[PDB]
mmCIF file of C-alpha atoms and ligand atoms in Angstrom:
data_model
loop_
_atom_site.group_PDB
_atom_site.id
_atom_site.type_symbol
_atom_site.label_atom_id
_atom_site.label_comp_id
_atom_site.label_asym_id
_atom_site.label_seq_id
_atom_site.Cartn_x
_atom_site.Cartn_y
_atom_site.Cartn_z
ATOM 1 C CA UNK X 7 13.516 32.791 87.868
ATOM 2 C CA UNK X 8 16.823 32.385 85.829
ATOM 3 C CA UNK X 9 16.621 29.139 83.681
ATOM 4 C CA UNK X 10 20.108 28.067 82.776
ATOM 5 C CA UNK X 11 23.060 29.536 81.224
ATOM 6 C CA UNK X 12 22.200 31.231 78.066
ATOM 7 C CA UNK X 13 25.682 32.427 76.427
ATOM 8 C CA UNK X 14 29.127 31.996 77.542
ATOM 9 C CA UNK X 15 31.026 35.195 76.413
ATOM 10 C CA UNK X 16 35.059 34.879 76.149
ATOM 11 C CA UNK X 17 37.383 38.081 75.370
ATOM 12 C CA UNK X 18 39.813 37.240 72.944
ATOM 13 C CA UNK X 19 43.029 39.193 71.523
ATOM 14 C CA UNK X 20 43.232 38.173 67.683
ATOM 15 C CA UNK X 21 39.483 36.816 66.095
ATOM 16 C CA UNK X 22 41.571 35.028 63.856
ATOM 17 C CA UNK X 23 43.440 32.097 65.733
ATOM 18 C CA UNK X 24 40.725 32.079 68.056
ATOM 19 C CA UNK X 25 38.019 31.063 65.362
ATOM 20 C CA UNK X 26 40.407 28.339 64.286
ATOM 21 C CA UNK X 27 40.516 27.117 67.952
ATOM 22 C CA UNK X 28 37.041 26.695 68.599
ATOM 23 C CA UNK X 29 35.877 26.097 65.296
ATOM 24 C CA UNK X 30 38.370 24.221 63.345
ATOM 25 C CA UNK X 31 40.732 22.663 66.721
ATOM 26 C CA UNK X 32 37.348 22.029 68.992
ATOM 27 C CA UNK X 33 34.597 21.169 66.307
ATOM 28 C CA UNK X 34 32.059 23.970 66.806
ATOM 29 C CA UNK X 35 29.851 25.152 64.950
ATOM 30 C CA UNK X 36 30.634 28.788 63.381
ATOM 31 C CA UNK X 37 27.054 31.048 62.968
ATOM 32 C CA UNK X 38 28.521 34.251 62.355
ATOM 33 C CA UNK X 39 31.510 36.628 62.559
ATOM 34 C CA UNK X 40 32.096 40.258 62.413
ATOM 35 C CA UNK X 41 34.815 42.688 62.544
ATOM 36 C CA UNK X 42 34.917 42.279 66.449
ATOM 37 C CA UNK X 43 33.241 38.876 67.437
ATOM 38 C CA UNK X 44 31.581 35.294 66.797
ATOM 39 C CA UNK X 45 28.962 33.635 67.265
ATOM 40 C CA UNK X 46 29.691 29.871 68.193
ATOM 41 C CA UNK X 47 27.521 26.656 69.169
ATOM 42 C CA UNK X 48 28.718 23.969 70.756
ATOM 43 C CA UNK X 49 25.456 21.341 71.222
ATOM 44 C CA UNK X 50 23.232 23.617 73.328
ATOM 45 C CA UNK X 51 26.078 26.117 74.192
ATOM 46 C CA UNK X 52 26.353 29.788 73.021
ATOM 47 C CA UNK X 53 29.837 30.881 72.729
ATOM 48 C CA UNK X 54 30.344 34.468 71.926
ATOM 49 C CA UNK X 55 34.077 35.296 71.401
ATOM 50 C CA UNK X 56 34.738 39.308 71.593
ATOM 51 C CA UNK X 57 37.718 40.692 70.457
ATOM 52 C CA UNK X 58 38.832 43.065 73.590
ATOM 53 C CA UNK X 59 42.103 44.934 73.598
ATOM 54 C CA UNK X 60 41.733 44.580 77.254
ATOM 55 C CA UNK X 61 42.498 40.737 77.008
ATOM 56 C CA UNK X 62 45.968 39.896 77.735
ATOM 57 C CA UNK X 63 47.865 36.572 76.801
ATOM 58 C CA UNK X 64 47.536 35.380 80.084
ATOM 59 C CA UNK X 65 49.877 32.695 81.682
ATOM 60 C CA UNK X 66 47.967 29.857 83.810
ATOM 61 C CA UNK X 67 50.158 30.888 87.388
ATOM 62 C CA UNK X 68 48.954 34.232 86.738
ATOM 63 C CA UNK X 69 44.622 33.183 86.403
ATOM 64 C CA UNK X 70 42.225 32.244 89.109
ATOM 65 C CA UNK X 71 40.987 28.891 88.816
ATOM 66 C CA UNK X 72 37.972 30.271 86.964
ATOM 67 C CA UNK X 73 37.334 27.713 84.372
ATOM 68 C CA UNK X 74 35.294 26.131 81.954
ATOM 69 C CA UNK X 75 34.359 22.201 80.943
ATOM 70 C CA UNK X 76 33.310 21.075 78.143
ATOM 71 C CA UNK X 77 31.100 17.321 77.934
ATOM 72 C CA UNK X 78 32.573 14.862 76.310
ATOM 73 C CA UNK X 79 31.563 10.684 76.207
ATOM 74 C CA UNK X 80 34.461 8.312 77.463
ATOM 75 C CA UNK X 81 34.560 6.544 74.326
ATOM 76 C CA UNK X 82 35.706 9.661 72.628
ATOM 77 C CA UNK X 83 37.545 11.481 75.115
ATOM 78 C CA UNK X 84 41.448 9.755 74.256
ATOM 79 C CA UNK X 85 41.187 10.248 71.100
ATOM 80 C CA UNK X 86 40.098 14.264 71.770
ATOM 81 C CA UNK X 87 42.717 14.751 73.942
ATOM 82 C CA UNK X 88 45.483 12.999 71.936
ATOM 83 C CA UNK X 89 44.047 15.631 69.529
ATOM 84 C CA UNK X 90 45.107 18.896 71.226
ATOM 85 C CA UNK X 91 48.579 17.010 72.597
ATOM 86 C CA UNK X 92 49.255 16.850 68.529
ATOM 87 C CA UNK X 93 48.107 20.415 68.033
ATOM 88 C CA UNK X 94 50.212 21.710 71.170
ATOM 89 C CA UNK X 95 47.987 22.473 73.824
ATOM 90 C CA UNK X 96 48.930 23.399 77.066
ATOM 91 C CA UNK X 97 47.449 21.780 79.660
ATOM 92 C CA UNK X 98 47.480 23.591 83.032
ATOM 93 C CA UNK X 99 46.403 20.654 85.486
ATOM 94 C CA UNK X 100 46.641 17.159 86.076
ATOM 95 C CA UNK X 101 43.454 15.196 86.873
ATOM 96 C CA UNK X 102 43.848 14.196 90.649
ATOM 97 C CA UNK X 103 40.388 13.208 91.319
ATOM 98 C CA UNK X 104 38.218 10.326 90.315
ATOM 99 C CA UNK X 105 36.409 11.074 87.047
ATOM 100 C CA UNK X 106 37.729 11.735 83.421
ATOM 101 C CA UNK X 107 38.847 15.381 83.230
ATOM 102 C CA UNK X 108 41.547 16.599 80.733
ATOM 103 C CA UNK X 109 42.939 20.239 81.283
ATOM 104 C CA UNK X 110 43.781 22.205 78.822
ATOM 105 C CA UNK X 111 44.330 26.754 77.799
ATOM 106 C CA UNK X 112 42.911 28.543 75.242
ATOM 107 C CA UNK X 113 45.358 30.782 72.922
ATOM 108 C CA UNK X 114 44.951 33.575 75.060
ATOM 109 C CA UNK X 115 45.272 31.799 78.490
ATOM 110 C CA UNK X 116 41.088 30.818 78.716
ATOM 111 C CA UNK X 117 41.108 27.620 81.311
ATOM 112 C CA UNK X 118 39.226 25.213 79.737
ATOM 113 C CA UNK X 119 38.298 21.469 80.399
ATOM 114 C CA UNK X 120 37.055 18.157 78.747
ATOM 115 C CA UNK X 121 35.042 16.383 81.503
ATOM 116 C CA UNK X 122 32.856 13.452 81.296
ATOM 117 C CA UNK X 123 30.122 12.858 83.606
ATOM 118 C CA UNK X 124 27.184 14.982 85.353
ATOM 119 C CA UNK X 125 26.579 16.593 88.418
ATOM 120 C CA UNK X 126 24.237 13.609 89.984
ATOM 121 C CA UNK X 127 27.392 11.075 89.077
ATOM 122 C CA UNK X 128 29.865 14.187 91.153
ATOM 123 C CA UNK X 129 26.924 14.191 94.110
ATOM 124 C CA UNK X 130 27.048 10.156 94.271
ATOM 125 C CA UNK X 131 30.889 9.619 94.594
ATOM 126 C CA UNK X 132 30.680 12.942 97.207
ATOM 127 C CA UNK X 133 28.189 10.912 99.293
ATOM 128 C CA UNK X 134 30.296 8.011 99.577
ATOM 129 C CA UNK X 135 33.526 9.637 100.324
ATOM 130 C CA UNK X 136 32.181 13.374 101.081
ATOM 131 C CA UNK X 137 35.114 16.557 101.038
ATOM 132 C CA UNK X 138 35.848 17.970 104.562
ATOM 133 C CA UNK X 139 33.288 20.049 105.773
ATOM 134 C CA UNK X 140 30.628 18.757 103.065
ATOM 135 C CA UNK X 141 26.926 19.325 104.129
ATOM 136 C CA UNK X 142 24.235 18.152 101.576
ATOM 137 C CA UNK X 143 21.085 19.925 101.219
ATOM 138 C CA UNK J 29 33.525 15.342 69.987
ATOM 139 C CA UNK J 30 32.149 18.014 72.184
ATOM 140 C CA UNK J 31 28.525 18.604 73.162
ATOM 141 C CA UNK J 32 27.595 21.080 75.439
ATOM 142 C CA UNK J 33 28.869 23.164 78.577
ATOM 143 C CA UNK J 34 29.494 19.896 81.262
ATOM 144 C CA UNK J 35 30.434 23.191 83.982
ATOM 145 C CA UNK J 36 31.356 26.458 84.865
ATOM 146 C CA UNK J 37 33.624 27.182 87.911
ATOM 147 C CA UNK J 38 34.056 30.618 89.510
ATOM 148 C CA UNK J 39 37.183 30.723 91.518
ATOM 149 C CA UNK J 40 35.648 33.045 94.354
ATOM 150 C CA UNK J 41 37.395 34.882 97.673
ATOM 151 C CA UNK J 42 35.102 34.174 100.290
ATOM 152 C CA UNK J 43 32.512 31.198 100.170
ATOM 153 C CA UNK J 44 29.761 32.371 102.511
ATOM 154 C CA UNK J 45 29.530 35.545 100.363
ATOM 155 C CA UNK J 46 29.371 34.005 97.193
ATOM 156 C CA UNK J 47 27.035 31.214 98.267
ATOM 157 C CA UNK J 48 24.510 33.673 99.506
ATOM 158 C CA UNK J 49 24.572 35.453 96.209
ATOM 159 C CA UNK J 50 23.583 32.707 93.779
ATOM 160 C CA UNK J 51 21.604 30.848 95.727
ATOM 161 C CA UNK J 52 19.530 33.749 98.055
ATOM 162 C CA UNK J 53 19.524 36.472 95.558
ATOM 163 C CA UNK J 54 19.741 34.350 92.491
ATOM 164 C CA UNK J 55 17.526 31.928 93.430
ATOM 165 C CA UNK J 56 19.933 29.004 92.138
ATOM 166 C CA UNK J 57 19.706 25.697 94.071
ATOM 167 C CA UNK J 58 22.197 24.876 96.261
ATOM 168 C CA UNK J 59 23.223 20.996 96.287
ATOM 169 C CA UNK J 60 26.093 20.908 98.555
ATOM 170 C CA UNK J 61 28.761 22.750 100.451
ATOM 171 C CA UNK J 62 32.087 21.873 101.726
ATOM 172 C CA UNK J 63 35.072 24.048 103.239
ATOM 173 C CA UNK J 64 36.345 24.968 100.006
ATOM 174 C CA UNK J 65 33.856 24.836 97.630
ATOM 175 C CA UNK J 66 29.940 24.629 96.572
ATOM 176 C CA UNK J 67 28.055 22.633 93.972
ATOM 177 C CA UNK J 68 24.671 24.580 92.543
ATOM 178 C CA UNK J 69 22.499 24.328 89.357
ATOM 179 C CA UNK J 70 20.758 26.545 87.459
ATOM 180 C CA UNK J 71 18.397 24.537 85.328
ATOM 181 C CA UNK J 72 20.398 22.571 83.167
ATOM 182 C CA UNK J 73 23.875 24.230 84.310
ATOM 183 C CA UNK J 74 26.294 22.844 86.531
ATOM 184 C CA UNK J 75 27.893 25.705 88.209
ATOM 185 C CA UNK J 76 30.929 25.258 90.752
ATOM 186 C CA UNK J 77 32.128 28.054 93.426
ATOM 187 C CA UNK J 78 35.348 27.175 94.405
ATOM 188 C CA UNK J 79 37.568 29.133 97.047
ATOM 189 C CA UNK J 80 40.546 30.549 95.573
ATOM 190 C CA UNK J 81 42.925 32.719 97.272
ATOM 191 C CA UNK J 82 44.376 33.904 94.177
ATOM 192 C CA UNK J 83 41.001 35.610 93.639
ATOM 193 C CA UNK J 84 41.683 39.233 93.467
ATOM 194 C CA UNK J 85 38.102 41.369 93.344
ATOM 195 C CA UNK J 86 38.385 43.613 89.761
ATOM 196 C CA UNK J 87 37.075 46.668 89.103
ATOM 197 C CA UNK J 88 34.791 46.202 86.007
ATOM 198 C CA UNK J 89 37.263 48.589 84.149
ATOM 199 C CA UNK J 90 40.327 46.674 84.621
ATOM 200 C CA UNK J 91 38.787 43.395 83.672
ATOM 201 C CA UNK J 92 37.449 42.146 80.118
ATOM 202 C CA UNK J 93 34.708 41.388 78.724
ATOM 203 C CA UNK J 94 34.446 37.493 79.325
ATOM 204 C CA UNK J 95 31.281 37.078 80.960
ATOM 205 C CA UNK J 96 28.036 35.213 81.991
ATOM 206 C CA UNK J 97 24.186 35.175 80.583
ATOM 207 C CA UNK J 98 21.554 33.768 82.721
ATOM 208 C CA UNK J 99 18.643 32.801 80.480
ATOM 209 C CA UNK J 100 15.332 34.573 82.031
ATOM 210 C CA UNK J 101 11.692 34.967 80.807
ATOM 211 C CA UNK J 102 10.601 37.723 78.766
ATOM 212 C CA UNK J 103 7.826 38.103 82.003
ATOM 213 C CA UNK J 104 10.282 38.032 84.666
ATOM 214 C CA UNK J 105 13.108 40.202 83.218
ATOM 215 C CA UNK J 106 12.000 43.349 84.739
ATOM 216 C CA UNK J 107 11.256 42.529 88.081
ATOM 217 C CA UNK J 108 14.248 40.329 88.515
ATOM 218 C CA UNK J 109 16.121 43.354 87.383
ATOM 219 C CA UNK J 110 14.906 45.519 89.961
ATOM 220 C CA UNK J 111 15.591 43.402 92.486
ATOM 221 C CA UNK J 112 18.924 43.147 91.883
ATOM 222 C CA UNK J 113 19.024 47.049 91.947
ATOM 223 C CA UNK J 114 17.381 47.294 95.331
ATOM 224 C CA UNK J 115 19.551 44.610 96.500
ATOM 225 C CA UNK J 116 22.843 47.054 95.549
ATOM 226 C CA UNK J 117 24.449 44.826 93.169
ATOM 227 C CA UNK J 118 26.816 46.695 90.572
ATOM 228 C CA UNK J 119 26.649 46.982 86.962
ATOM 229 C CA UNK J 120 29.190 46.864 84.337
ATOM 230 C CA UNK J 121 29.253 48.454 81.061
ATOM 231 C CA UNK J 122 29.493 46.251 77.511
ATOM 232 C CA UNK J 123 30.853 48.005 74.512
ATOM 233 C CA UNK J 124 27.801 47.000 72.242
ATOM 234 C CA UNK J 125 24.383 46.235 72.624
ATOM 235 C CA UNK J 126 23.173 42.294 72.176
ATOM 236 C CA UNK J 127 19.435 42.823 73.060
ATOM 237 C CA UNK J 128 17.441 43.079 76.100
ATOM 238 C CA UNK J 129 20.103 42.528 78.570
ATOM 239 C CA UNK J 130 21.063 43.555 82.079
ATOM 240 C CA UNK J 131 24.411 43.717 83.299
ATOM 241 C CA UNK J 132 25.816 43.011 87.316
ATOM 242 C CA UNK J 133 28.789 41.694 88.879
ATOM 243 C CA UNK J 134 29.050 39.178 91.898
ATOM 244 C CA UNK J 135 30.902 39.846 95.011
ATOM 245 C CA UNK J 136 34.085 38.767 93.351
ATOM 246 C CA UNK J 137 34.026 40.926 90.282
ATOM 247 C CA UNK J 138 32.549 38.117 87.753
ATOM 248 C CA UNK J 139 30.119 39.935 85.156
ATOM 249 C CA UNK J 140 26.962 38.483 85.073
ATOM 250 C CA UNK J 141 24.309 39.147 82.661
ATOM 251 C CA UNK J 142 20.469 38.610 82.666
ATOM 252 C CA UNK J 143 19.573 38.146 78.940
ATOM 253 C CA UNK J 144 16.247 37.159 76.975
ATOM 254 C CA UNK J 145 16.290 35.637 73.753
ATOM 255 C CA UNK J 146 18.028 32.781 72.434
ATOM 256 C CA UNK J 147 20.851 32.295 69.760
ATOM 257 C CA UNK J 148 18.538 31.677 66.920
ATOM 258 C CA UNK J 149 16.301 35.131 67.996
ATOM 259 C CA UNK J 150 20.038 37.471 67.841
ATOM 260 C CA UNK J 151 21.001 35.961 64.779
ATOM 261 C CA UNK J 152 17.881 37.271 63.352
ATOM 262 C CA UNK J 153 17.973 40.727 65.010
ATOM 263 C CA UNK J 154 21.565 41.102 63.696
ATOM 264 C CA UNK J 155 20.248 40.469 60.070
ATOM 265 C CA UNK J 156 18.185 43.584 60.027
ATOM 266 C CA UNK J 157 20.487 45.120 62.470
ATOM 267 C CA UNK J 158 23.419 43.903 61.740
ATOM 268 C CA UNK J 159 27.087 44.374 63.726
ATOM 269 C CA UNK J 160 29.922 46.064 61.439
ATOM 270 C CA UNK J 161 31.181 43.678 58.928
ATOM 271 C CA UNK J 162 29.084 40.962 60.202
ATOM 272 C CA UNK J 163 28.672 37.592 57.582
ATOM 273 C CA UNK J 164 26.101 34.717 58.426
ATOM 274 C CA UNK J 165 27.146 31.026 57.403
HETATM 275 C C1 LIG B 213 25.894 27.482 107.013
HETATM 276 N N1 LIG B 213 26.362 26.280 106.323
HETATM 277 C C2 LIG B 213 25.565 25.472 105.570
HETATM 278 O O1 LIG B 213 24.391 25.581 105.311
HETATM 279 O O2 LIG B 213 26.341 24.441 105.083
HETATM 280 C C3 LIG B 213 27.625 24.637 105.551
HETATM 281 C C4 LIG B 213 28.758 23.890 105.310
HETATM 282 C C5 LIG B 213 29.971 24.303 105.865
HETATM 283 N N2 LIG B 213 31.130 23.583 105.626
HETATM 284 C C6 LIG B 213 30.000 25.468 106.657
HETATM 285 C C7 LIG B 213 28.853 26.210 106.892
HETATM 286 C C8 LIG B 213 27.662 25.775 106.325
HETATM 287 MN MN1 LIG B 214 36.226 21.551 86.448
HETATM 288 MN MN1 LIG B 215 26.304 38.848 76.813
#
């Protein structure tokens, strides 16, 4: 039986300014680095970023909502995201929904996300006001 | 500051497909379903399906390497491998090895990856092994 996620692998197009990102930008911790890739942590996550000369620069009309959220506490999250507005950080979405979410790209179009709170908080507001067509199991 | 993976969404073209793939051939457990979307876990990981139009199904050739590991037991790695084969998922193809791995893609084209071993057991395969040019911090 599968466990949980173990690594989270993201293509990237330069090593360089994508190492700043996560590292310097985002606050992760940097293991190792080669000529083509890193090694990342981010609390219990395993980022690997992989330089692929298949990645394009990609604009957010032209992705799938595919995405990727990162936990946060609410007493921190402002300040983190008047962080990236300084640094000039696209964001690609406005929050709509109930919850703290903060959406935000990658330098080479990655859709990423600060979000605070857990799945039991999502399954509690979804039971009092449930989506159309929502079945619990 | 940031502390772990909070989600992963997979934008997906079909629900009913996609549901039936993580949760009756991966074995993830479904929480709840709506017209447009699904909530499962995986352990510890949050993972989203959410219907996307947009979603265009990729050859593995024309896509990158950004992909998934699933964390699975030294024990269970085989079999759950050869279930997948007899089940007719498809494979992909990484450009370097990262240990005992096995590589599929979902209906939609995501790339998936079965993988034992944690961060702290590849960093210490790559130091007697190491990848081109590697450095360790
Ligand atoms: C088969 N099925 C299920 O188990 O939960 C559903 C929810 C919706 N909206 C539509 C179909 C299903
Ligand atoms: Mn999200
Ligand atoms: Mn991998």
């Amino acid at each position: 039986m599968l466990s949980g996620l173990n690594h989270l692998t993201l293509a990237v197009s330069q090593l360089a300014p994508s190492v700043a990102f996560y590292q310097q930008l985002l606050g992760m911790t940097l293991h190792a680095r080669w000529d083509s890739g890193a090694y990342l942590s981010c609390g219990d996550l395993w980022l690997c970023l992989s330089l692929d000369p298949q990645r394009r620069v990609t604009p957010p009309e032209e992705s799938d909502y595919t995405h990727y959220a990162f936990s946060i506490s609410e007493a921190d999250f402002a300040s983190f995201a008047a962080r990236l507005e300084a640094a000039g950080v696209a964001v690609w979405k406005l929050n709509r929904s109930e919850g703290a979410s903060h959406y935000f790209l990658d330098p080479d179009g990655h859709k990423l996300e600060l979000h605070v709170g857990s799945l039991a908080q999502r399954l509690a507001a979804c039971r009092e006001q449930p989506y159309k067509g929502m079945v619990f199991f």
